[PDB]
Design an enzyme around this catalytic site. Structure first.
Site, PDB file in Angstrom:
ATOM      1  N   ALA A   1       0.826  -1.206   0.000  1.00 26.24           N
ATOM      2  CA  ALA A   1       0.000   0.000   0.000  1.00 26.24           C
ATOM      3  C   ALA A   1       0.862   1.259   0.000  1.00 26.24           C
ATOM      4  CB  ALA A   1      -0.944   0.003   1.208  1.00 26.24           C
TER       5      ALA A   1
ATOM      6  N   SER B   1       0.052   0.709   5.057  1.00 25.57           N
ATOM      7  CA  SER B   1      -1.278   0.230   5.405  1.00 25.57           C
ATOM      8  C   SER B   1      -1.320  -0.183   6.870  1.00 25.57           C
ATOM      9  CB  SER B   1      -1.707  -0.943   4.512  1.00 25.57           C
ATOM     10  OG  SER B   1      -0.916  -2.112   4.725  1.00 25.57           O
TER      11      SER B   1
ATOM     12  N   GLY C   1      -1.526  -4.669   6.218  1.00 20.00           N
ATOM     13  CA  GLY C   1      -0.462  -5.547   5.779  1.00 20.00           C
ATOM     14  C   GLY C   1       0.443  -5.943   6.930  1.00 20.00           C
ATOM     15  N   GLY C   2       1.060  -7.122   6.799  1.00 20.61           N
ATOM     16  CA  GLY C   2       2.027  -7.546   7.799  1.00 20.61           C
ATOM     17  C   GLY C   2       3.252  -6.655   7.803  1.00 20.61           C
TER      18      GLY C   2
ATOM     19  N   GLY D   1       3.270  -3.353   6.185  1.00 18.31           N
ATOM     20  CA  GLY D   1       2.768  -2.031   6.489  1.00 18.31           C
ATOM     21  C   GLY D   1       2.479  -1.835   7.960  1.00 18.31           C
TER      22      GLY D   1
ATOM     23  N   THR E   1      -7.378  -7.613   1.758  1.00 16.09           N
ATOM     24  CA  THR E   1      -6.917  -8.924   1.332  1.00 16.09           C
ATOM     25  C   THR E   1      -7.029  -9.981   2.421  1.00 16.09           C
ATOM     26  OG1 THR E   1      -4.596  -8.780   2.006  1.00 16.09           O
ATOM     27  CG2 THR E   1      -5.241  -7.584   0.040  1.00 16.09           C
TER      28      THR E   1
ATOM     29  N   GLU F   1      -6.631  -8.299   9.358  1.00 12.76           N
ATOM     30  CA  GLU F   1      -6.228  -6.895   9.355  1.00 12.76           C
ATOM     31  C   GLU F   1      -6.656  -6.146  10.617  1.00 12.76           C
ATOM     32  OE1 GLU F   1      -5.739  -6.625   4.523  1.00 12.76           O
ATOM     33  OE2 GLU F   1      -6.463  -4.873   5.641  1.00 12.76           O
TER      34      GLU F   1
ATOM     35  N   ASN G   1      -5.542   4.934  -5.730  1.00 15.18           N
ATOM     36  CA  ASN G   1      -4.290   5.592  -5.383  1.00 15.18           C
ATOM     37  C   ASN G   1      -4.117   6.932  -6.079  1.00 15.18           C
ATOM     38  OD1 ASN G   1      -3.793   3.475  -3.725  1.00 15.18           O
ATOM     39  ND2 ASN G   1      -2.266   2.476  -5.059  1.00 15.18           N
TER      40      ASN G   1
ATOM     41  N   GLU H   1       4.533  22.607  12.059  1.00 17.98           N
ATOM     42  CA  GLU H   1       3.316  23.406  12.002  1.00 17.98           C
ATOM     43  C   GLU H   1       2.066  22.535  11.897  1.00 17.98           C
ATOM     44  OE1 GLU H   1       3.911  27.091   9.830  1.00 17.98           O
ATOM     45  OE2 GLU H   1       1.790  27.067   9.222  1.00 17.98           O
TER      46      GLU H   1
HETATM   47  N1  GTP Z   1      -5.649   2.327  -1.001  1.00 15.66           N
HETATM   48  C1  GTP Z   1      -4.812   1.308  -1.228  1.00 15.66           C
HETATM   49  N2  GTP Z   1      -4.818   0.235  -0.369  1.00 15.66           N
HETATM   50  C2  GTP Z   1      -3.985  -0.806  -0.574  1.00 15.66           C
HETATM   51  C3  GTP Z   1      -3.104  -0.827  -1.647  1.00 15.66           C
HETATM   52  N3  GTP Z   1      -2.416  -1.991  -1.584  1.00 15.66           N
HETATM   53  C4  GTP Z   1      -2.836  -2.693  -0.496  1.00 15.66           C
HETATM   54  N4  GTP Z   1      -3.818  -1.964   0.130  1.00 15.66           N
HETATM   55  C5  GTP Z   1      -4.565  -2.288   1.357  1.00 15.66           C
HETATM   56  O1  GTP Z   1      -3.631  -2.644   2.358  1.00 15.66           O
HETATM   57  C6  GTP Z   1      -4.059  -3.796   3.066  1.00 15.66           C
HETATM   58  C7  GTP Z   1      -3.113  -4.934   2.735  1.00 15.66           C
HETATM   59  O2  GTP Z   1      -1.821  -4.502   3.081  1.00 15.66           O
HETATM   60  P1  GTP Z   1      -0.551  -4.541   2.079  1.00 15.66           P
HETATM   61  O3  GTP Z   1       0.096  -3.169   1.945  1.00 15.66           O
HETATM   62  O4  GTP Z   1      -0.919  -5.124   0.722  1.00 15.66           O
HETATM   63  O5  GTP Z   1       0.425  -5.562   2.877  1.00 15.66           O
HETATM   64  P2  GTP Z   1       2.027  -5.379   2.975  1.00 15.66           P
HETATM   65  O6  GTP Z   1       2.409  -4.108   3.695  1.00 15.66           O
HETATM   66  O7  GTP Z   1       2.686  -5.401   1.615  1.00 15.66           O
HETATM   67  O8  GTP Z   1       2.469  -6.572   3.975  1.00 15.66           O
HETATM   68  P3  GTP Z   1       2.527  -8.148   3.590  1.00 15.66           P
HETATM   69  O9  GTP Z   1       1.461  -8.825   4.430  1.00 15.66           O
HETATM   70  O10 GTP Z   1       3.915  -8.634   3.947  1.00 15.66           O
HETATM   71  O11 GTP Z   1       2.296  -8.384   2.119  1.00 15.66           O
HETATM   72  C8  GTP Z   1      -5.458  -4.090   2.588  1.00 15.66           C
HETATM   73  O12 GTP Z   1      -6.338  -3.391   3.430  1.00 15.66           O
HETATM   74  C9  GTP Z   1      -5.456  -3.495   1.197  1.00 15.66           C
HETATM   75  O13 GTP Z   1      -6.742  -3.147   0.762  1.00 15.66           O
HETATM   76  C10 GTP Z   1      -3.080   0.256  -2.522  1.00 15.66           C
HETATM   77  O14 GTP Z   1      -2.308   0.268  -3.481  1.00 15.66           O
HETATM   78  N5  GTP Z   1      -3.944   1.322  -2.305  1.00 15.66           N
HETATM   79  C1  E44 Z   2     -10.655 -16.168   4.388  1.00 13.69           C
HETATM   80  O1  E44 Z   2      -9.771 -15.100   4.067  1.00 13.69           O
HETATM   81  C2  E44 Z   2      -8.784 -15.364   3.150  1.00 13.69           C
HETATM   82  C3  E44 Z   2      -8.800 -16.573   2.471  1.00 13.69           C
HETATM   83  C4  E44 Z   2      -7.814 -16.861   1.554  1.00 13.69           C
HETATM   84  C5  E44 Z   2      -6.789 -15.949   1.304  1.00 13.69           C
HETATM   85  C6  E44 Z   2      -6.763 -14.733   1.992  1.00 13.69           C
HETATM   86  C7  E44 Z   2      -7.774 -14.457   2.914  1.00 13.69           C
HETATM   87  C8  E44 Z   2      -5.663 -13.730   1.763  1.00 13.69           C
HETATM   88  C9  E44 Z   2      -4.657 -14.116   0.701  1.00 13.69           C
HETATM   89  C10 E44 Z   2      -4.462 -15.592   0.671  1.00 13.69           C
HETATM   90  N1  E44 Z   2      -5.759 -16.228   0.383  1.00 13.69           N
HETATM   91  C11 E44 Z   2      -5.914 -17.074  -0.767  1.00 13.69           C
HETATM   92  N2  E44 Z   2      -4.877 -17.828  -1.129  1.00 13.69           N
HETATM   93  C12 E44 Z   2      -4.980 -18.624  -2.182  1.00 13.69           C
HETATM   94 CL1  E44 Z   2      -3.591 -19.580  -2.592  1.00 13.69          CL
HETATM   95  N3  E44 Z   2      -6.054 -18.756  -2.942  1.00 13.69           N
HETATM   96  C13 E44 Z   2      -7.153 -18.002  -2.622  1.00 13.69           C
HETATM   97  C14 E44 Z   2      -8.327 -18.085  -3.394  1.00 13.69           C
HETATM   98  C15 E44 Z   2      -9.388 -17.316  -3.048  1.00 13.69           C
HETATM   99  C16 E44 Z   2      -9.276 -16.470  -1.928  1.00 13.69           C
HETATM  100  N4  E44 Z   2      -8.194 -16.366  -1.180  1.00 13.69           N
HETATM  101  C17 E44 Z   2      -7.111 -17.132  -1.512  1.00 13.69           C
END
Ligand code: GTP
Ligand code: E44
Ligand code: ACP
Ligand code: GDP
Ligand code: CA
Ligand code: MG
Ligand code: MG
Ligand code: MG
Lengths: 54, 437, 427, 332
Positions: free
Chosen positions: B12, B140, B143-144, B146, B179, B183, B228, B254
């Site tokens: 993100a 974000s 994300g793990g 972020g 995703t 979260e 974005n 500020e």
């Molecule tokens: N607005 C916006 N949200 C994003 C974007 N990419 C990911 N997100 C949001 O961020 C969250 C997922 O976090 P990520 O930034 O993809 O995870 P990460 O920091 O790469 O960490 P990992 O778990 O290691 O992949 C979800 O709520 C997504 O909807 C983006 O490009 N724009």
């Molecule tokens: C219940 O919430 C979920 C469930 C699955 C997953 C995620 C969150 C986040 C990414 C990984 N994921 C997935 N992985 C893989 Cl291989 N196929 C998928 C196919 C459909 C949906 N999801 C995934």
């Protein structure tokens, strides 16, 4: 409504309008936290390897 | 002039930084190769835009930016993209396996192995600064990386740069686009660990951005590119005062003085108008009064909430385009009579206004129409605590069963950090309640 | 993000070969190992499952294991049999005799170290190994007993990698021997401890789908494996094809598994299709959604309405309205919200891939973590106890050095698993 | 199929609305805490408005207006009328009132000008003509309460020399239509009004419960509009519409139009409706006074069927359609 601190330049201007007046952890503490967590991972993994050895 | 370094963490943060730096270049006339013809002082300078760009002897204008991700896929797209010549390779830092949507894996397991490298690369940029102000951190909540890596990075930046301000641009999780199911855990953990290290944080709820794109841009299913580019417009409105001549919000210090009277309540609400679709064949340009009034419509906020049922502590109007103070005050006078705008008793009831005459810039071929005037309101209202309420409730539902907790404990985290983080959030909600009623 | 694939025993190798046929077609790879595809999407993540060989030929990162040569000779004879690396064929000659103890303790112990050598050689060439996926049955001897021995050993040598299995559950409707409940109960105990995610492929469900829905009066293993290869293609879609998610085995495990032992998924597929019969009418997104959640499309013979969904992952394949997908997916949750535990918010996640599987223009694959899977473990548990109360057929096992206590422990563990699933069905 | 949850098990009115909804066959009820609802019949206090309108793919509606309590708490009502220009410049239909904390200067300023004018000087919290007598009650109670003029010369129905209050039910929908139910009720006192003994309990307080002589003149000490209208015709040579209801309708409109900007959900991510109970007093000059507004009213048993059905028709089915009206729309 009093307008305050009017600043003008070529890029624009700024000002303030009032409608009504009023009525950290150290580096070492961080590395202690990070390493305490790593001990816990290594401990949990040693238990797994011990269980697998049994 | 005082430099600002931008740090983009995780997917993100990296992707929103692409959008912001693309926009910045278009606003300052900097081409994808780094050349800036209008800059007549070659190889250096202390102009306002030098806050965000350094200069090489060959006239290249390079962002004062570092990109960090625990996995290479997304930063690889920057390394091969339209602006690949803009950044030096050492500002694009990637690992090989991400945090698997797990705060503990990003903060402890993997983060501990890359934090020192990131700090050295950040140190390289700070050494090129004559008067570093501080950092703007993009990430974000969900994300793990972020979440987990950002909080570790923020702790260290406090240690290595004790005197520097740190601002956040944080993406709040929305199931419409999110995703991962965990979260809410990552959000609460990272807010707890980062709260004391952040001076001012602008939250953007993907739900708000998503609906703005569907309603005002007529995009049936917005993409990250749709979200974005819109987010970059708001970010540009917020940072314009650092990059342009002016008297309002000219240094990071500020922002805190103008928007944050209490340190912990440091989450200003952003509202932006007008968002107009490029596809519309006939559009009637909105006046100063109309766009200022839109700043009080919840449908235009970066977080959906009801400011009528909270109290204000600070309010800035950041205009771009054809705006004169007379029209602003006339619009504010009308709005005050027709809207529920209550300030806390220990703050004056007023607006700090800043106007940049250059109308907003839009990316060619993007979804936003060109407008004659736009505004971004930064208001610090207790109403934003609704987002915390929403998040803490979801956290409570899962943590009551300890669902997924074993993935965090397995990375070295202790269960007690969940409850420590959640009680800090409980304190945060209570603080907002004391100030708000 | 490399995956190392392992297929063990007769069933493991028969579905494992079908899997490599189906996804090799989807990635435009021929039996030669040469890529003759049309889209670059087919090659963006080809490294997940294939190694690049000399002259730009893709070799599956697959290891073929058996305790008898028969089924593996068939694989080498088969259509894509020449695509596999010859060194990755690891086999004995004695066979396991449908005996878990022979696969786990005696015959399989002799062979397991040579399998581990090929696994190591495949892992050492990986830029960043995600983990492993195993294809096996639980009702035989090699795939069940040696397969779980391999899983135990692989976890000892790669403790921080993900272990994924496609495990075929025995059924008296499709039954080779009476000791299948023994073999399966002994294996489930290993799977509960040493895998992160297991697709529960129930031969009972495969039979019923072939009989009741596909109108096949006498289903073969070939008909059952048609359902298996379609499910295996669907559930790995987001591993093999680029998308918004960029999914991998660990992220799947983190999001699908709220409690470490409850990692046994009900897979589902739609539309259900019999072999060599083409459906000319495509399914509408509403129809894809309704079928994929239908118990009649579940590959584990469990009634989803008898439990609750902890998590769900759905993958839609084809050119379709993602808006319509979003509406339909939200429709089933909002209209049946009682069957999704309320204490995991937003626990249904959906992905879409533009590329449909061969023979279909629209498909839907379902991955459910439902507490109703306990029905499968109770079924096996009853068949087990019916023989074990009389110590029937145990001599086949005590002759390989096992003690009755190990059966008592395995039975107890699986009953604990059952009651653990019941705990969250009431929460 | 529409989904709804119920979080106020004490609601007589919404008990009946749950039954009506289920009986349509097109509404299914979920558990209190299931978030995937269309409609929330919410709790009376600390209802979590902040969690509404964030469920993708669900139009969400709730039977309460966030911020409506400003009209439904005696203390807030007074402050709202005094400070809102829409009301107080004269505001001739609300009794004089002052907020007093037990732990006033403006109150006594008027009370003593009544001592100077030898005018009626009875007030209420509880009733007495001696300020010091009731303030000693204010401070020994410990919570905030208001002090407003007591309507000394009410309109008394004959036979009985009794006093009463009028309760009107008004529904406000998601569009901020103001719907006044055509059936009101007079909550009547069986005890003849006495000007001398205010400490006497039952003759001055017309609350239904407080009247534990109950039921003498009419059933339930409840006189409905048809009878009351007939009385006004036979007795005073006028109608309910002309002499009282015009003023009531004006007061309901004025109160709800005032706070409309603060509570409207017109451009909100969730929607609100709310049923209100307006309580009025009528003086002997056929002048209507607003006593208070109740944000969680109960109905009269006779009327539960027709009103709870109207809540579904006008406030629920308007938003969630299914597979001569009983309200008077008050226009604005
Ligand atoms: N607005 C916006 N949200 C994003 C974007 N990419 C990911 N997100 C949001 O961020 C969250 C997922 O976090 P990520 O930034 O993809 O995870 P990460 O920091 O790469 O960490 P990992 O778990 O290691 O992949 C979800 O709520 C997504 O909807 C983006 O490009 N724009
Ligand atoms: C219940 O919430 C979920 C469930 C699955 C997953 C995620 C969150 C986040 C990414 C990984 N994921 C997935 N992985 C893989 Cl291989 N196929 C998928 C196919 C459909 C949906 N999801 C995934
Ligand atoms: N200024 C006033 N003048 C004359 N009578 C008054 C009065 N204020 C109240 N009363 C009488 O006291 C009774 C109760 O007063 P009030 O309406 O303030 O509380 P309440 O018991 O009705 C709670 P609710 O209205 O929600 O049921 C009224 O019915 C009315 O007869
Ligand atoms: N679905 C399916 N099940 C099979 C197949 N082959 C064997 N089985 C099942 O697997 C069990 C026998 O195990 P098998 O793989 O033949 O024994 P192994 O060679 O010792 O591993 C029985 O439950 C069979 O029904 C197959 O090709 N498809
Ligand atoms: Ca310069
Ligand atoms: Mg990532
Ligand atoms: Mg066999
Ligand atoms: Mg009351």
């Amino acid at each position: 409504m009093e307008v305050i601190e009017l600043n003008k330049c070529t890029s624009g201007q700024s000002f303030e309008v009032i409608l009504k007046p009023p009525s950290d952890p150290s580096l070492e503490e961080i590395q202690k936290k990070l390493e305490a967590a790593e001990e816990r991972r290594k401990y949990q993994e040693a238990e797994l390897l011990k269980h697998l050895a049994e | 002039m005082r430099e600002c370094i931008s740090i983009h963490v995780g997917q993100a943060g990296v992707q929103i930084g692409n959008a912001c730096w693309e926009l910045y270049c278009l606003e300052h006339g900097i081409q994808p190769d780094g050349q800036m013809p209008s800059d007549k002082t070659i190889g250096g300078g202390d102009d306002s835009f030098n806050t965000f760009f350094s200069e090489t002897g060959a006239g290249k204008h390079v962002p004062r930016a570092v990109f960090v991700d625990l996995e290479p896929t997304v930063i690889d797209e920057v390394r091969t993209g339209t602006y690949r010549q803009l950044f030096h390779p050492e500002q694009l830092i990637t690992g090989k396996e991400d945090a698997a949507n797990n705060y503990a894996r990003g903060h402890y397991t993997i983060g501990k192995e890359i934090i020192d490298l990131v700090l050295d690369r950040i140190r390289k940029l700070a050494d090129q600064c004559t008067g570093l102000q501080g950092f703007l951190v993009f990430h974000s909540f969900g994300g793990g990386t972020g979440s987990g890596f950002t909080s570790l990075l923020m702790e260290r930046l406090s240690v290595d740069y004790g005197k520097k301000s740190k601002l956040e641009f944080s993406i709040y999780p929305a199931p419409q686009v999110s995703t991962a199911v965990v979260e809410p855990y990552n959000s609460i953990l990272t807010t707890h660990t980062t709260l004391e290290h952040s001076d001012c944080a602008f939250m953007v709820d993907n739900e708000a951005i998503y609906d703005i794109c569907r309603r005002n841009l007529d995009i049936e299913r917005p993409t990250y590119t749709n979200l974005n580019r819109l987010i970059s417009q708001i970010v540009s409105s917020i940072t314009a005062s650092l990059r342009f001549d002016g008297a309002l919000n000219v240094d990071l210090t500020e922002f805190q003085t103008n928007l944050v009277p209490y340190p912990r309540i440091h989450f200003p609400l952003a509202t932006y108008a007008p968002v107009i679709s490029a596809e519309k064949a006939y559009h009637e340009q909105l006046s100063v009064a109309e766009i200022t009034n839109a700043c009080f419509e919840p449908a235009n906020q970066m977080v959906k909430c009801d400011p009528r049922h909270g109290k204000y502590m600070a309010c800035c109007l950041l205009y771009r385009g054809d705006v004169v103070p007379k029209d602003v005050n006339a619009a504010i006078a009308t709005i005050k009579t027709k809207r529920s705008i209550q300030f806390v008793d220990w703050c004056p009831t007023g607006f700090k206004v800043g106007i940049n005459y250059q109308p907003p810039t839009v990316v060619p071929g993007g979804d936003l129409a060109k407008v004659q005037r736009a505004v971004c309101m930064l208001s610090n209202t207790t109403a934003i605590a609704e987002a915390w309420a929403r998040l803490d409730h979801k956290f409570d539902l899962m943590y009551a069963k300890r669902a997924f907790v074993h993935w965090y404990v397995g990375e070295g985290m202790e269960e007690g950090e969940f409850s420590e983080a959640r009680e800090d959030m409980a304190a945060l909600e209570k603080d907002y309640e004391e100030v708000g009623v | 993000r490399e995956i190392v694939h392992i297929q063990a025993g007769q069933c493991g190798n028969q579905i494992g070969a079908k899997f490599w046929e189906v996804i090799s077609d989807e990635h435009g790879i021929d039996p030669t190992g040469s890529y003759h595809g049309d889209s670059d999407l087919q090659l963006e993540r080809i490294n997940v499952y294939y190694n690049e060989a000399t002259g730009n030929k893709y070799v599956p990162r697959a290891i073929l294991v058996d305790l008898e040569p028969g089924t593996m000779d068939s694989v080498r004879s088969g259509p894509f049999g020449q695509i596999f690396r010859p060194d990755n064929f690891v086999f004995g000659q004695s066979g396991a005799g449908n005996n878990w103890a022979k696969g786990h303790y005696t015959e399989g112990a002799e062979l397991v170290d040579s399998v581990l050598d090929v696994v190591r050689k495949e892992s050492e060439s990986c830029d960043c190994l995600q983990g492993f996926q195993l294809t096996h049955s639980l009702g035989g001897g090699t795939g069940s007993g040696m397969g779980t021995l391999l899983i135990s050993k692989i976890r000892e040598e790669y403790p921080d990698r993900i272990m994924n299995t496609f495990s075929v559950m025995p059924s008296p409707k499709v039954s080779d021997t009476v000791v299948e409940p023994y073999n399966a109960t002994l294996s489930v105990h290993q799977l509960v401890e040493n895998t992160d995610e297991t697709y529960c492929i129930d031969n009972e469900a495969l039979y019923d789908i072939c009989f009741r829905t596909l109108k096949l009066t006498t289903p073969t293993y070939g008909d059952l494996n048609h359902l298996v290869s379609a499910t295996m293609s669907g559930v790995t879609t987001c591993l093999r094809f680029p998308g918004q998610l960029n999914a991998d085995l660990r992220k799947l495990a983190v999001n699908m598994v709220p409690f470490p032992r409850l990692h046994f998924f009900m897979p589902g597929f739609a539309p259900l299709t019999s072999r060599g019969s083409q459906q000319y009418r495509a399914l509408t997104v509403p129809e894809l959604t309704q079928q994929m959640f239908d118990s009649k499309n579940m590959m584990a013979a469990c009634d989803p309405r008898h439990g609750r969904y902890l998590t769900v992952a759905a993958i839609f394949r084809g050119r379709m309205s993602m808006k319509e997908v979003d509406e339909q997916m939200l429709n089933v949750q909002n209209k049946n919200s009682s069957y999704f535990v309320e204490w995991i918010p937003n626990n249904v996640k959906t992905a879409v891939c533009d590329i449909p599987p061969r023979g279909l223009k629209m498909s839907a694959t379902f991955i459910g973590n439902s507490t109703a899977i306990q029905e499968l473990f109770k079924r096996i548990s009853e068949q087990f106890t019916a023989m074990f109360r009389r110590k029937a057929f145990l001599h086949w096992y005590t002759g390989e050095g096992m003690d009755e206590m190990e059966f008592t422990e395995a039975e107890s563990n699986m009953n604990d698993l059952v009651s653990e699933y019941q705990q969250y069905q009431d929460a | 199929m529409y989904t709804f949850v119920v979080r106020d098990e004490n609601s007589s009115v919404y008990a009946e609305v749950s039954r009506l909804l289920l009986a349509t066959g097109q509404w299914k009820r979920l558990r209190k805490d299931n978030p995937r609802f269309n409609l929330m019949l919410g709790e009376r206090n600390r209802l979590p408005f902040g969690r509404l309108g964030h469920e993708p793919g669900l139009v969400q509606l709730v039977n309460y207006y966030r911020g409506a309590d400003k009209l439904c708490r005696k203390a807030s009502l007074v402050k709202l009328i005094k400070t809102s220009p829409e009301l107080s410049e004269s505001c001739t239909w609300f009794p004089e009132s002052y907020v007093i904390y037990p732990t006033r200067e403006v109150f006594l300023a008027a009370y003593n000008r009544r001592r100077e004018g030898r005018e009626g000087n009875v007030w209420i919290a509880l009733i007495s003509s001696e300020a010091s007598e009731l303030l000693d009650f204010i401070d020994e109670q410990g919570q905030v309460h208001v002090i407003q003029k007591y309507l000394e010369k009410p309109l008394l129905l004959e036979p009985g020399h009794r006093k009463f209050d009028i309760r009107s039910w008004v529904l406000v929908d998601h569009l901020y239509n103001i719907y006044l139910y055509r059936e009101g009720v007079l909550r009547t006192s069986s005890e003849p009004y006495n000007s001398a003994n205010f400490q006497d309990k039952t003759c001055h307080l017309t609350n239904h419960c407080i009247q534990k002589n109950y039921g003498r003149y009419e059933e339930g000490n409840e006189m409905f509009f048809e009878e009351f209208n007939q009385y006004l015709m036979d007795a005073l040579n006028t109608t309910l519409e002309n002499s009282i209801l015009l003023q009531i309708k004006h007061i309901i409109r004025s109160c709800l139009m005032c706070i409309e900007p603060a509570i409207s959900t017109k451009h909100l991510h969730y929607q609100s409706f709310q049923l209100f109970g307006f309580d009025f007093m009528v003086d002997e000059e056929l002048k209507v006074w607003l006593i208070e507004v109740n944000g969680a009213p109960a109905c009269a048993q006779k009327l539960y069927a027709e009103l709870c059905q109207g809540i579904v028709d006008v406030a629920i089915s308007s938003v969630f359609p299914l597979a001569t009206s009983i309200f008077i729309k008050l226009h604005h």
